[PDB]
Design a protein around this ligand. Structure first.
Ligand SMILES: CC(=O)N1c2ccc(-c3cc[nH]n3)cc2[C@H](Nc2ccccc2Cl)C[C@@H]1C
Ligand SMILES: CC(=O)N1c2ccc(-c3cc[nH]n3)cc2[C@H](Nc2ccccc2Cl)C[C@@H]1C
Lengths: 115, 109
């Protein structure tokens, strides 16, 4: 099903920890609530919702088999934001800022995955 | 030249450049050719694979994360500018997943 690996530990304790506490992270810590936000078209446009709270819970429950699977969920979270929102929305700039940190930290992840 | 930039050139760019969905991304967006008079009003930092490839060939980058940010900007511009239902968005998503899969095995500095 899933494993604990050196890389998944790094994504959890180093990458996710740094993104979670960021001042721009608050819109991303829980699923988009289309009802609360009054976005009745959100789920007609975005077919795979994702958020850091869901990723964090997956990391804690050993859901992922490999680091790449977790990285793809981070990517989906950011990509959903760019696809749905207007280019001028502040949330787009917040996602871009977080995504740059994600890439910087991923650049220093351990090279070979080990259980 | 670093270990990581060599990986980005020999593994990541090699895989992306020859991909069957790469052709819209191999040269800068030509807004005149494509009839997109608002492209440069929305997208303020254009980026494309031909530019990244030339920068790798020319030892332009000082750190691997700089190259990774250019890949990211190229994909993000596509998501921001295009309509969600445009095929180019699916093509970018496919290429970006390959990018992330390969970056998962990139060496450390
Ligand atoms: C991530 C994302 O895609 N979105 C999202 C998700 C959650 C929240 C949220 C959580 C708690 N309160 N509001 C807000 C937003 C964005 N709205 C927004 C963002 C920043 C400033 C002002 C606004 Cl209006 C819309 C968009 C659909
Ligand atoms: C990457 C990107 O953002 N775009 C882009 C860039 C270059 C090209 C291109 C190069 C040579 N010929 N066409 C086309 C496109 C997209 N168009 C498009 C893509 C696939 C199928 C049909 C169409 Cl209409 C629009 C969008 C603005």
């Amino acid at each position: 099903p899933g494993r604990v690996t050196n890389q998944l530990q790094y994504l959890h304790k180093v990458v996710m920890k740094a993104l979670w506490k960021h001042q721009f992270a608050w819109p991303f810590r829980q699923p988009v609530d289309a009802v609360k936000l009054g976005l009745p078209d959100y789920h007609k446009i975005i077919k795979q919702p994702m958020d850091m709270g869901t990723i964090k819970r997956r990391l804690e429950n050993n859901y992922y088999w490999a680091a790449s699977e977790c990285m793809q969920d981070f990517n989906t979270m950011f990509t959903n934001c760019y696809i749905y929102n207007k280019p001028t929305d502040d949330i787009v700039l917040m996602a871009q800022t977080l995504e740059k940190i994600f890439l910087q930290k991923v650049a220093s992840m351990p090279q070979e995955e080990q259980e």
